[PDB]
Design a protein around this nucleic acid. Structure first.
Lengths: 113, 274, 66, 348, 199, 64, 120
RNA sequence: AUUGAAAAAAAUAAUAUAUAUUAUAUAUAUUAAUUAUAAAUUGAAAUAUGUUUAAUUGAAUAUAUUUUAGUAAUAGAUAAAAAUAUGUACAGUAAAAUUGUAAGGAAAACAAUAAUAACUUUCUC
RNA sequence: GAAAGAAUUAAAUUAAUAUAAUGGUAUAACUGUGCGAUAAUUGUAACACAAACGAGUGAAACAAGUACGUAAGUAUGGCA
């Protein structure tokens, strides 16, 4: 009927498939449904607020930068030129790592190079 | 059929009739997939995404600061040129195609608080070419992909036909999976930390790699996939591992911006940039 | 010649009744080369893993530091 | 805690059921849902874990937001803005959501869903837009009741009709239904549910049922026929069922003549239109209007011309459509209308 | 609740020592049996799981024990330390001859070199080559300006990567955005609030 | 000669036949059309007994 | 016996030499005391290894230099003189007696394996 | 209906049950199921009753009884791979080209490649 | 200021369409899809188009029943 390789392939396929592995549908009572809706809506609102806060902050930073660069242009042309360069190949430093869940054994390195 | 003449009749009102809602056929389908009452419901925001949080906190501001060019105006792309009306044959003529390209190119905007570059989507294209002989290899590749991602893969089929390579048309051959949001972020984090350091002579992603507009890519060999912890868990069940292409899609206007963004997430870049 | 698994009749998923594939996933703790632990969701059943070769002990990822 | 206060706020914003309210607001998931009436089913049921504390936090968050909105709402002077503020404050209230979703909107009981309350009215409007309004629009366009009678419609009020007096059965007419001559023998009952902010005391309404498809053999075309005409009707958000109780004999500009389609004349559209009166400033009380009853004719009726004359704006519509059956002759006889014509089966 | 069944048949092979341990760890679901009332409905089972409920699956050789997120420095409230807050963005503040706190100022007399580079050099000089910094960009984030002293302080952004600071300025500290408000003046804070990350 | 003609007879004992054309291996055809004689639609089965290529039964249930 | 150091082995197979076999970075004496430090009773087969024990086994091989990791070291020692003026480099590059053996006749062996990355 | 936990109802739909009318209505009642269907010496597990440990719980463990496991793809109103080419209803847009990308190359697959005025909704200074 | 939607313009009929060539095609005929599998039905066909005739082509409509669609409806085989 089937080889051992064929069997193993079928098993692998099954791992991915939804055939006889999935539970019943999540039914709720009307009160429960409402509670869920209120949870979700509030959360969504909170997320929107956070986005606006961050977005606003970014806008403020941009405005400050603009204000700075105009001033620099007014005062010292050479300094302005130096500031406003193409940073095409700018690379973030490899020490600035993505913050983990829990910290390492040695928290901070005081010596380098 | 009395005729094939298609011709949508005009209306006498501005109300937008959603035809789906007027039926009683698919009552479960009227609910949004986000809604709890839909069978399509899935808990989306299950836990705090770490890479995304990092981007929000540290990187995004830094990226904005980098990308500020003073009084930078919009750079319009190559577009379809109109004809000068110096002849009456120009009068209903289609526009001249773009200068260098056949297809139109997008406008490059200055980076401000709104349009800072960020990760948009990851796609993991795995086309196993031995599966022209063995269909079961495609299945195994799809499983591997699923294991790696925690996301449902989609089967790739042979779209073309060719004699030199023993390839038919309409044959299942490997799989793909578009990661988005938190799963994608996790996958990137795993790539940065676990997998890519275990690749021996790994210099990084090439600086000559990428789209013209905010898309960067690279690929992993069958040797490299055995470093993923899910495959590592049961390497026995992964003898014939399959390589894969990894298309990272950013919200970057240009490719150097995208590269910079990826560097922020601890991706090394080695080659000479364009 | 071509090795295949021959398909049975497909099961009709009705419109609206399609359910999203929520695979069984465990919360897995990865301790990297150094003692920095990180939680990640994973399909293989192993609550704890400790890694030997990571970015946190590779020279490319930190140039300054049988 | 603004949503627990009911000094200034209406009673309708609370849940009237006590058990349901208790279930909503508890400190642990101990109680079982009042919705599940049967014990065995309650036993079987298991709500999702941790739902209570999070729900409470969400309530607090949205309650705070509502309170903040109210701080603005009371300072506001202009009425539409104030209403909008009120809506914003209370729309995310769980209790009002429960009330609206799970109790009838058509024949709303005032204590549960009060359409005098702005939030509930907004909810009702949204519900109407989701399905019933779209359906009505489709039936107007497909049947060709808009351009044939009255150019366009911008649906504002939800209009539902009924024929209670003829047969006995209770049924709200779905737009574009085929009703028997027995069903539509005696007059209908309207319900004009208004969702916009409007002056309830001043604003009058007119209702016109028009039959565009009565055949005129001189013209070799059709003509309109005003089958039923009411004017100067007073609506209120909750008190809105236009019945012989409400309107007086003075309000009837053309008293109900029934659908009596001729044999082979075809299907006849009867499309009720609901207009609101023009509102005059510097005049307290409801501004009436006089109709020249000799000028307007029933056997031929320019609806558009009439609208132009009295400066009406069509807010709502509904439509049924009648064709010939055996009982139309009986209906005619009852009303004292003539025998009724019979046309050739072929449209030659 | 919505998750699939764990496909144990794949990850654990039948008739193996590893499977047996997993089985022992697990506890099975109650099956349906004729002539009995199940008041929580009849058991719906497939691959050995109650479909009606959530499934729980209980699982050098060493237990992975994570380190405490709060630190010794945090406990002591040492403001000069870099390990004192691990979940927040710390910013270097400095106290001058007067009682005021502020972000490190430096006089740019030469104006030959670029501004960010000069800043970095000044920092390095202050440190005694303990610090290891990285400028995010050559562009200045903002300016602090005033009428009494006709000056213009162009603010650079830069990231401490690996080093001490430890040292004209009297004292210094490493603080979050919330603590800087307490330390620094109100007007100054208003000027430079948005530059700092909230977390 | 790749197509032929059968004789779909009417379930109702009327005699009405709706001759249609079919391939050589014609999945025993059964069409539901109008039987004027009996003033109603009805199913039409083949008349002469022909043959169908060994068509495998579909495995709706999982087996072997 | 299992996937020990990836390319593992089989049971019944006494570990001592088993390591000398599959592994290339270790063999003979090295594999002998390699078990000694891990202290496994000699004449002990793979099937008997208490998985946890293999863990130590693995780490042990990491400590010293094993696998084709050393294949390269020699490859470089070869390339070294080869890169300098070295009769060997010719003998090695051409595929000829690098040990100055019978080029005239018995030299097929050299031609068969002796080459830039010899150990193939 | 029977146990847990600690007066009633009121949308919508669906099912159940009834009854009004030359009106597919209403009345009360409750919220089932929603990826499945034979055939498994052995795999797994649940319950009921058989021995030791603190009447007695847990453990082991044996017999019946069953239940599971026959492991298999689409989870999307799918959308230019192959599959049905007549009807209907709903919905969407292709190809080419170029910058790419493990093997990959002229020729596998995969990703990206026009414009946002206005309009609405939500947050927000 | 931001998101999200609804989309709108442009471009396109070069793709594709059961098959030649032309004509048509995105308002899509083309593509995906649910249902279905019935109208790839049954009597009278006016009236044109074409046309020597025999023939051929479109087809209103009347009547009987079927199918799908909330509905408007559409369907007497296929874009021609």
């Amino acid at each position: 009927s089937l080889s051992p390789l064929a069997q193993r392939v079928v098993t692998q396929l099954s791992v991915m498939s939804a055939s006889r592995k999935q539970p019943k549908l999540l039914k709720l009572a009307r009160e429960d449904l409402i509670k869920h809706q209120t949870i979700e809506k509030c959360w969504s609102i909170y997320q929107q607020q956070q986005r606006e806060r961050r977005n606003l902050q970014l806008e403020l930073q941009y405005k400050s930068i603009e204000r700075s660069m105009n001033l620099l242009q007014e005062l010292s042309p050479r300094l302005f030129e130096a500031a406003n360069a193409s940073e095409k190949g700018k690379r973030f430093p490899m020490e600035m790592k993505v913050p983990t869940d829990f910290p390492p054994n040695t928290l901070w390195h005081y010596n380098f190079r | 059929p009395k005729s094939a003449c298609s011709l949508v009749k005009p209306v006498h009102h501005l109300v937008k009739i959603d035809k789906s809602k007027l039926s009683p056929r698919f009552p479960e389908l009227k609910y949004d997939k986000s809604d709890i009452r839909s069978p399509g419901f899935k808990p989306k925001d299950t836990h705090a995404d770490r890479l995304n949080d990092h981007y929000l906190n540290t990187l995004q501001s830094d990226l904005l600061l980098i990308n500020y060019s003073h009084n930078a105006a919009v750079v319009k792309g190559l577009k379809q040129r109109a004809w000068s009306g110096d002849s009456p044959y120009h009068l209903n003529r289609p526009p001249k195609n773009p200068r260098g390209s056949k297809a139109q190119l997008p406008d490059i905007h200055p980076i401000k608080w709104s349009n800072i570059p960020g990760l948009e989507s990851v796609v993991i294209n795995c086309f196993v070419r031995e599966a022209r002989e063995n269909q079961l290899l495609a299945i195994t590749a799809a499983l591997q992909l699923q294991q790696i991602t925690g996301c449902k893969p989609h089967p790739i089929f042979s779209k073309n036909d060719v004699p030199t390579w023993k390839l038919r048309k309409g044959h299942q051959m490997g799989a793909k999976v578009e990661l988005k949001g938190k799963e994608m972020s996790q996958f990137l984090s795993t790539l940065t930390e676990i997998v890519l350091p275990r690749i021996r002579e790994y210099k990084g992603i090439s600086n000559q790699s990428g789209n013209r507009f905010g898309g960067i890519s690279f690929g992993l060999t069958a040797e490299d996939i055995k470093f993923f912890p899910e495959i590592d868990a049961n390497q026995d069940s992964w003898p014939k591992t399959f390589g894969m292409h990894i298309n990272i899609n950013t919200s970057a206007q240009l490719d150097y911006q995208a590269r910079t963004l990826l560097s922020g997430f601890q991706f090394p870049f080695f080659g000479e940039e364009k | 010649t071509r090795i295949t698994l021959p398909r049975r009749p497909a099961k009709k998923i009705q419109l609206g009744k399609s359910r999203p594939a929520i695979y069984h996933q465990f919360n897995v703790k990865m301790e990297l080369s150094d003692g920095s632990v990180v939680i990640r969701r994973s399909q293989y059943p192993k609550g704890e893993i400790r890694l030997i070769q990571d970015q946190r002990n590779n020279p490319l990822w930190n140039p300054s530091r049988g | 805690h603004i949503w627990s206060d009911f000094t200034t706020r209406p009673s309708s914003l609370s849940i009237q059921s006590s058990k349901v309210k208790n279930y909503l607001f508890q400190k642990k998931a101990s109680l079982d849902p009042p919705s599940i009436s049967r014990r065995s089913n309650r036993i079987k049921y298991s709500p999702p874990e941790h739902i209570d504390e999070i729900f409470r936090m969400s309530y607090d968050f949205l309650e705070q937001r509502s309170s903040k909105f109210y701080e603005l709402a009371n300072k506001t002077k202009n009425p539409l803005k104030k209403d909008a503020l009120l809506i914003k404050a209370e729309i995310n209230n769980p209790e009002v959501q429960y009330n609206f979703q799970f109790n009838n909107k058509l024949n709303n009981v005032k204590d549960i869903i009060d359409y005098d309350v702005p939030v509930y009215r907004h909810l009702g409007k949204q519900h109407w837009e989701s399905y019933g309004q779209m359906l009505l629009m489709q039936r107007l366009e497909t049947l060709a009741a808009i351009p044939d009678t009255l150019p366009t419609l911008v649906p504002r009020a939800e209009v539902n009709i009924k024929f209670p007096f003829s047969t006995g059965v209770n049924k709200w007419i779905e737009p574009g239904e085929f009703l028997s001559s027995n069903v539509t023998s005696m007059r209908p009952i309207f319900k004009i549910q208004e969702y916009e902010l409007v002056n309830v005391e001043k604003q009058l309404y007119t209702v016109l049922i028009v039959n565009p498809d009565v055949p005129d053999l001189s013209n070799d075309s059709f003509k309109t026929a005003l089958c039923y005409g009411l004017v100067n009707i007073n609506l209120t958000y909750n008190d809105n069922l236009i019945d012989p109780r409400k309107f007086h004999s003075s309000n009837i500009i053309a008293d109900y003549l029934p659908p009596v389609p001729e044999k082979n004349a075809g299907k006849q559209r009867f499309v009720v239109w609901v207009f609101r009166q023009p509102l005059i400033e510097d005049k307290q009380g409801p501004n009436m209007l006089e109709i020249d009853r000799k000028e307007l004719s029933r056997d031929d009726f320019d609806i558009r011309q009439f609208t132009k004359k009295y400066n009406l704006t069509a807010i709502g519509a509904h439509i049924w459509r009648s064709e010939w059956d055996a009982k139309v002759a009986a209906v005619r006889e009852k009303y004292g209308l003539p025998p009724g014509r019979v046309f050739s089966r072929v449209r030659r | 609740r919505l998750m699939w069944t764990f496909p144990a048949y794949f990850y654990f092979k039948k008739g193996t020592v590893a499977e047996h341990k997993f089985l022992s760890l697990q506890k099975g679901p109650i099956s349906k049996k004729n002539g009995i009332w199940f008041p929580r409905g009849i058991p719906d089972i497939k691959h050995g799981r109650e479909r009606s409920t959530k499934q729980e699956v209980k699982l050098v050789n060493r237990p992975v024990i994570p380190n405490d997120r709060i630190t010794e420095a945090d406990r002591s409230n040492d403001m000069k330390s870099l390990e004192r807050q691990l979940s927040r963005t710390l910013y270097l503040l400095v106290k001058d001859k007067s009682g005021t706190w502020k972000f490190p100022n430096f006089d740019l007399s030469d104006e030959s070199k670029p501004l960010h580079v000069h800043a970095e050099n000044e920092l390095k000089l202050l440190s005694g080559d303990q610090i290891y910094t990285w400028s995010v960009s050559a562009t200045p984030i903002g300016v602090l300006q005033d009428e009494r002293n006709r000056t213009a302080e162009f603010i650079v952004k830069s990231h401490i990567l690996a080093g001490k600071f430890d040292l004209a300025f009297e004292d210094f500290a490493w603080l979050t955005k919330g603590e800087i408000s307490e330390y620094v003046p109100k007007d100054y804070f208003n000027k430079t609030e948005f530059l700092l990350a909230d977390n | 000669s790749k197509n032929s003609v059968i004789k779909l007879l009417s379930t109702a004992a009327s005699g009405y036949s709706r001759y249609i054309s079919i391939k050589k291996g014609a999945p025993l055809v059964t069409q539901v059309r109008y039987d004027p004689v009996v003033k109603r639609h009805v199913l039409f089965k083949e008349a002469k007994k022909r043959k169908v290529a060994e068509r495998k039964p579909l495995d709706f249930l999982r087996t072997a | 016996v299992v996937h020990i150091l990836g390319k593992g082995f089989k049971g019944k197979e006494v570990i001592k030499i088993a390591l000398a076999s599959k592994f290339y970075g270790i063999g003979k004496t090295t594999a002998e005391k390699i078990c000694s430090k891990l202290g496994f009773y000699p004449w002990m087969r793979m099937h008997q290894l208490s998985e946890p024990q293999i863990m130590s086994i693995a780490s042990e091989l990491s400590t010293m230099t094993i696998e084709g990791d050393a294949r390269a070291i020699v490859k470089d020692n070869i390339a070294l003189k080869r890169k300098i003026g070295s009769y060997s480099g010719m003998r090695h590059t051409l595929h000829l007696p690098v040990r100055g053996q019978h080029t005239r006749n018995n030299a097929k062996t050299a031609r068969k394996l002796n080459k830039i990355d010899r150990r193939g």
